[PDB]
Nucleic acid binder design. Sequence first.
RNA 1: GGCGUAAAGCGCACGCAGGCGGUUUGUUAAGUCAGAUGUGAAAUCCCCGGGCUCAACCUGGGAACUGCAUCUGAUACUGGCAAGCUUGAGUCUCGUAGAGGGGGGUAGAAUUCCAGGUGUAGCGGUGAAAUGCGUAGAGAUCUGGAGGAAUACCGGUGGCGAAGGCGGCCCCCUGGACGAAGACUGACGCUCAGGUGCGAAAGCGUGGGGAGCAAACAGGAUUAGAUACCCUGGUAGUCCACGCCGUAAACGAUGUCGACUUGGAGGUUGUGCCCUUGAGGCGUGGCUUCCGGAGCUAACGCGUUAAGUCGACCGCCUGGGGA
RNA 2: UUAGCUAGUAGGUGGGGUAACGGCUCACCUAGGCGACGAUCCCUAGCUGGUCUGAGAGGAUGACCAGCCACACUGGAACU
Lengths: 129, 104, 88, 14
Amino acid sequence: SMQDPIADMLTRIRNGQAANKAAVTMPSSKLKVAIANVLKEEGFIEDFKVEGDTKPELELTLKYFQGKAVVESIQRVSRPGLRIYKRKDELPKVMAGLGIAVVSTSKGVMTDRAARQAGLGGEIICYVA
Amino acid sequence: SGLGQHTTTAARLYHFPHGGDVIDSPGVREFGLWHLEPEQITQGFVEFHDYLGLCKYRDCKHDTDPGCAIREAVEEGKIAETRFENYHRILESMAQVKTRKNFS
Amino acid sequence: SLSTEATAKIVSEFGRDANDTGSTEVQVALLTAQINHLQGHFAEHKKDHHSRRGLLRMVSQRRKLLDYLKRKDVARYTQLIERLGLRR
Amino acid sequence: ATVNQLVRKPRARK
RNA sequence: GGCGUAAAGCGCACGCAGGCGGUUUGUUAAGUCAGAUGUGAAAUCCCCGGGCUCAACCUGGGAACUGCAUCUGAUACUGGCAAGCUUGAGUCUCGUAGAGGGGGGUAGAAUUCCAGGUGUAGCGGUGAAAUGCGUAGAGAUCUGGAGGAAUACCGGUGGCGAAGGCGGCCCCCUGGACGAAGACUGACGCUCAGGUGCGAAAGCGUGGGGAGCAAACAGGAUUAGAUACCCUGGUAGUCCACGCCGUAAACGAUGUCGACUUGGAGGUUGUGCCCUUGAGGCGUGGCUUCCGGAGCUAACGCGUUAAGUCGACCGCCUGGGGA
RNA sequence: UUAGCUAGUAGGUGGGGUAACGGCUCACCUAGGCGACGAUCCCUAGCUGGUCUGAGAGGAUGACCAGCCACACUGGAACU
Ligand SMILES: Nc1nc2c(ncn2[C@@H]2O[C@H](COP(=O)(O)OP(=O)(O)NP(=O)(O)O)[C@@H](O)[C@H]2O)c(=O)[nH]1
Ligand SMILES: [Mg+2]
Ligand SMILES: [Mg+2]
Ligand SMILES: [Mg+2]
Ligand SMILES: [Mg+2]
Ligand SMILES: [Mg+2]
Ligand SMILES: [Mg+2]
Ligand SMILES: [Mg+2]
Ligand SMILES: [Mg+2]
Ligand SMILES: [Mg+2]
Ligand SMILES: [Mg+2]
Ligand SMILES: [Mg+2]
Ligand SMILES: [Mg+2]
Ligand SMILES: [Mg+2]
Ligand SMILES: [Mg+2]
Ligand SMILES: [Mg+2]
Ligand SMILES: [Mg+2]
Ligand SMILES: [Mg+2]
Ligand SMILES: [Mg+2]
Ligand SMILES: [Mg+2]
Ligand SMILES: [Mg+2]
Ligand SMILES: [Mg+2]
Ligand SMILES: [Mg+2]
Ligand SMILES: [Mg+2]
Ligand SMILES: [Zn+2]
C-alpha cells in the first residue's frame, strides 16, 4: 500500500513539477524531512514547512525556470522488494556527476559528493537527475 | 442411410482378357455445361435432331412459344414427357449456373 | 448481526465499560455469537453458497483477530478461548 | 518481471 | 523485455507457509558501511621493466584476485526487543438503496390437452407448394376444468453480487455494500505457490415430471444428391430432488491493493446548509457511462474507474505448425 | 511426467575398535531422524586455479601448465 513512503514522496514531486503546480503537500515523517532538507540545500526545491503534530503534514514549494521543470526526472533506486547498498568507492554518479545521488549513512543524509570527504557508504535513496 | 459413398479414386487402368482397356470413374455428382451455346443443347439429343426445322419460328425457346412442333411431338406421345420436362430443366439450370460468371 | 439487546450486552460482558466496544476481545465475541447463531441455518440451507461466503468471511476474520492477541498478551488469550469454547 | 519471482525459479534458458 | 487486440493476467474467491509493511522514542548492533589483521599457492591476464638480432616467447617487481574469517568502530536506513501514537485497517449506534442467495405459498395472461355449446369447408403452412389435420364437425368463438414452464408493460451503457450470473407478488431465514454523527482497539495490514470452495450451458448416475420448444430420427418440398436450409411431427434433454462432471469468446480479450496528476455531458445513491420563499439554490461522499487535455502507446485507443507517473506481491509468455 | 524417505536408520548407556574423535562395531534403551530453503529416486559429469567470448554484468567449457580426488583387465579381501 503505502509501504514505500519515499516512493510515494517522489510520486507527488514528479507530478506537480510537470503539471505546473505551485505547491504540494504530503504526510510528514522524520526521513522525509531528512531528504527534502538536502534538496533545499541543493537548489532543487525552495522551502518546506511542517503542519500538525498528531497528523504530521509536510509541504513543499515547487521551482521552475520559465515554467520549465527544474527536477526533470527522479528515479527511486532501492526499494522494499530489493535493497541496494554500495561501498565508499562504488558510489554511482548521476549524469556523470551532474545529478546527485541521495545516500543515507551513519553521519546523516548527504550526497555522493559530500560522501567523498566523509568516506562512507550505505543505502542509495534516489537519483536526483 | 439412403445415400452412396465414393470410396474408389479417379481412374485405375486394367486390360480385358480379349482386348481393350477399362477406365473406372469417381462417384460424380457434377454437371459442367459451361462449354457452348444452348444451340448445342439441341444437338445433345438423338430423336430431337429429326424434328428440328418443323416449328413455327426460325428461333424458338420451345417452352413459352406458341406452336412448337417439338412440343407437339411430346403431346402426340412419340416423345415421352419425362424427357421434355427434363429438357427445359437443363435450360433452366443454365439460368442458375450462369449467374456469377465462369470462363476458361 | 443481532438485535440491540444482544449486541450491547456482550460489549458490557467482556468490555471494561460501555465505551469499551472497539477492542479485539469484543470483536471475537461479535463473531463467536454470530457463527453459533448460523449453525442451524446452514444445516437447513446447504444450497445457499452465497451466504456461506459471508460465513467463511467471519471465520477467517475471527482467526486473524485471535492471532493478534496470541502474539502480544497470552494471558488474555487463554481466558477467552475457554470462556467462549474455542480451540476445539 | 518481479525479482522476488525469480528467487523461486530463474529465467529458463532454452 | 513484455502480457487491451502481435505469444502471454489462472473463471473467481478465501487463506497457511513465504515475501513485504504507517508513524514516534529507546535499545541491540543482526543486515549494511568504515578501519585493521590473517588469508585468497604459483603460473595466466593487467602496469612498468629486462633478455633472446626482432616478434612470438621467457622473466623481475607491483597491481589485481571485486573472496572469506576475526577484531575495533559509527547508528541514518532495514531487522529484533521495549514503550507508544492514530491518518492504514477494524468495532458500535442511527439509517438508506438493491433482480444478493436459500426455503415455502400465491396471482393472472398465453400455450397445449380435455369437456360442453353455437357454427361450416376448408384449416394449417411457404418464395411457391406438399406432408399433416378436418364433415367422427376441424379451424374460429364462448363456457368450464386440468397440467407444465416462464414472468409483458414497468425497464433504462439502470441496480446488486467475487465471478458465472441474478427479474410476477408476498412472507420467513440470511449475506455483503454505502452514508451521517461521535465513541473505541492500536498496524491488528497488503499479497499469495500448494491447499479449499464457488463456478454458464451441454453431458452422466438414481428417482420423479412433461405443456411448449427441440439433437437423433419420421415425413414432405428443395436439389445433381438434401444428409443441412424450409415446412408438418417428434424422443433424449430442457423441469425438480439427490449427486457427479469443473470446461466456455467464464471478455472490460485488462490479477489484486495503495498513493498522487487539468477537466466536461450525464445517470444512480446519500448527506450538510439555505429569503423551506417549488420536486429548487449552494456544497459534499459511494457507484457508473460517454467525450477529451497533458502524458503514454506499434497504431487503434486509454486518459482521475489509466492502457499516465510509482510502490507491494502473485500468475503467465519465448517463431508458426507439430500441440 | 521423482513427495514422502530411512531400523544400525536418529540419539543415549556400556563393551570392543583405529594413530586420532565418532554406530566405526556389538548388546541394551529411546522413537526419533531427514524433507518443499528439494529429502529420496533417475540421468549426466572429475573438480578448481583458468581458457575463450563479451563494454561490463554474464555466458560456454575444464586439452596442454599447476593443485587435489578417484582409478590401474572385472570383482572381493588381507598382509608387509
Ligand atoms: N445385391 C447386389 N449388390 C450388389 C450388386 N452389385 C454390386 N453390389 C454391391 O453394391 C455395393 C457397391 O459396389 P461398388 O462397386 O463398391 O460401388 P462403386 O460404384 O464402385 N462405389 P464407388 O463410387 O466408391 O467407386 C457393394 O457392396 C456391392 O457388393 C448386385 O448386382 N447385387
Ligand atoms: Mg444488514
Ligand atoms: Mg519483446
Ligand atoms: Mg494474441
Ligand atoms: Mg477474470
Ligand atoms: Mg549505551
Ligand atoms: Mg598465483
Ligand atoms: Mg609472481
Ligand atoms: Mg607474468
Ligand atoms: Mg624489444
Ligand atoms: Mg526500527
Ligand atoms: Mg393458460
Ligand atoms: Mg487509546
Ligand atoms: Mg445418460
Ligand atoms: Mg430439427
Ligand atoms: Mg437427466
Ligand atoms: Mg480455457
Ligand atoms: Mg471492448
Ligand atoms: Mg489532445
Ligand atoms: Mg477518453
Ligand atoms: Mg514451441
Ligand atoms: Mg561408545
Ligand atoms: Mg605431460
Ligand atoms: Mg592433473
Ligand atoms: Zn419450337
